[PDB]
């Protein structure tokens, strides 16, 4: 139906994803998870039952939490959709293996499970059992990838059940490389080592990088779901207002249980003293346009139009705000 | 009481810890840790009550698996009191705070606590809950510190109720960093910077370092910590034989569990072709003399018997080969 036309935008940038979650019942997830394992043949290359697919997502999907605004199933399926036209881009044509494939999108699905809806900061501060578990470090990330983990130990979830051991060994590792990488206390770090990446940067004839160690491999995929995951802003403006406004929805709620405990409110979590404009021109100017900027520079001139979008968004942003 | 002839020890490199388990009716840990938090003052300092110290310290030796021949509370309670000792080396006069003191000493309380006896390895390789929650990075480690910290915050158990809330936090963060620095994957990069605080080494006139910063002290600790978990071999020989009687016993059990599960057994964890003489010797080349080689000269010249010890129990278990 309109569902299966919406679908065909699955390689695209700026798929509406807020229309697939509205027409699936809310399994936006599942759906674009399947279509793009479709898409991938990545389910005959691994064996993968459809059926054990199709529950392990659901399940996945059903971790996510429903009255989270920002970090829920919706912000996992976008995650997923933009890693796989990241994946795609001519400039990686033919680097990277199935299984390293299949390691990323895995990675964007699970990346930010059962999401409270809170910083780590927030966790850490108010002395969660989630923080002392993990000794405030990649509090949420670490959780994220136990949970998603762990729920393929559920009944017929067990979407690997074919890979060979070693194979299973090497996705576990590239997974948590991945998601701990999407911790935002390594972004100034991460950033670092990507430019440093760029400036020495090997190609081949043809025109694609040259990645010949773990290091330099794990590194670009750890870059790229860093970008998918900071992506917003690069998106057609009527996607981006939306995913603002959630993101305001969350940070403002956890202001509000900052202030009914006499703490400190962090930046732009209070919803009386917040301006959207001016905090969305300072996220792209100080962290999603440095990064962004840095993966065009690799993938030249393949992400020239994500580049201009965010740079257009950032104008339309700041044309508001009263300036000297 | 016998026990208190004993205890005039604990500020000694070589106290008698297996003999202060017997007296205590196994409880070392909590009798040293008592004995040494009265000697350094720190129940004044931290307004510590003398019965929240000794129910949480109970409390915590009794999350020491007593059927672990080697990460037991009487190893908990010889690297506490091997940082006591430590921390007491001339070279460190007046360096750390009391808190830092602190943490260094309730860091070495907690660092093995409810270990089960296999390693790191083990536990990723067998696919354990505990593995699947740390993601496979120093699982037991994480795991020491996150029981060691729950467990203040069981009945009369909160020995840090009246630090400020700034205390605590710079507290549980030198003890995290200090735990997570005794995982061996770090042995390497962790000596490594050591090496280079010594080459860079400042002192006062009297040889007292000059530590500059949190970098600067942390790394000392964290160093200081690791070198009292790997101290066994530089104790006076009859100590060091039981040691490596209990640590070869622990492997050997680890290793009858990879055998049964058709598992590759991990290096010096088979019984059946061991040889325990030459690996000790090993262990003392590759690992504890480099590392304590190096704390030797951080501290020069307040570690030379402990490193001349080191080089005699070397050449005892060099004597011992088959
Ligand atoms: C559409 O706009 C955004 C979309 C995504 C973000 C993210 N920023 O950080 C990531 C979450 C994270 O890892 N945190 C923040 C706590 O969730 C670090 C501690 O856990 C996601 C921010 C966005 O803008 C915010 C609104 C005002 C400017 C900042
Ligand atoms: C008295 O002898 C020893 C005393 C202490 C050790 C240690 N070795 O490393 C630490 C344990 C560790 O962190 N492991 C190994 C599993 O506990 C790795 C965690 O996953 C403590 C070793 C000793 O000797 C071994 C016996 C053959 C030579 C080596
Ligand atoms: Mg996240
Ligand atoms: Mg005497
Ligand atoms: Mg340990
Ligand atoms: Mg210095
Ligand atoms: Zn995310
Ligand atoms: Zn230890």
């Not at 964007?108 to 966790?123: K, R």
């Not at 773990?214 to 970008?227: G, P, T």
């Not at 840095?294 to 979008?309: E, F, G, K, M, N």
């Amino acid at each position: 139906d309109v569902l299966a036309k919406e679908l065909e935008d699955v390689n695209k940038w700026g798929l509406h994803v807020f229309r697939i979650a509205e027409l699936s019942g809310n399994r936006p997830l599942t759906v674009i998870m399947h279509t793009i394992f479709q898409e991938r043949d990545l389910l005959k290359t691994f064996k993968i039952p459809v059926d054990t697919l199709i529950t392990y997502l659901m399940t996945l999907e059903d971790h996510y939490h429903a009255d989270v605004a920002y970090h829920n199933n919706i912000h996992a399926a976008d995650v997923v959709q933009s890693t796989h036209v990241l994946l795609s881009t001519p400039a990686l044509e033919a680097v990277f293996t199935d299984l390293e494939i299949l390691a990323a999108i895995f990675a964007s699905a699970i990346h930010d499970v059962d999401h409270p809806g809170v910083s780590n900061q927030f966790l850490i501060n108010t002395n969660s059992e989630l923080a002392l578990m993990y000794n405030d470090s990649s509090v949420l990330e670490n959780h994220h990838l136990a949970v998603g983990f762990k729920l393929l130990q559920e009944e017929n979830c067990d979407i690997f059940q074919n890979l060979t051991k070693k194979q299973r060994q090497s996705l576990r590792k590239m997974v948590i490389d991945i998601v701990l990488a999407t911790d935002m206390s390594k972004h100034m770090n991460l950033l670092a080592d990507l430019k440093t990446m760029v400036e020495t940067k090997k190609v081949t004839s043809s025109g694609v990088l040259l990645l010949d160690n773990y290091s330099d491999r794990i590194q670009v995929l750890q870059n790229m779901v860093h970008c998918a995951d900071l992506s917003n802003p690069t998106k057609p403006l009527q996607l981006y207002r939306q995913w603002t406004d959630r993101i305001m929805e969350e940070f403002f709620r956890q202001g509000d249980r900052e202030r009914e405990r006499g703490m400190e409110i962090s930046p732009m979590c209070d919803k009386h003293n917040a301006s959207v404009e001016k905090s969305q021109v300072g996220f792209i100017d100080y962290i999603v346009h440095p990064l962004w900027e840095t993966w065009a520079d690799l993938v030249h001139p393949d992400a020239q139009d994500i580049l201009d979008t965010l740079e257009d968004n950032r104008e339309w942003y700041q044309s508001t705000i009263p300036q000297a």
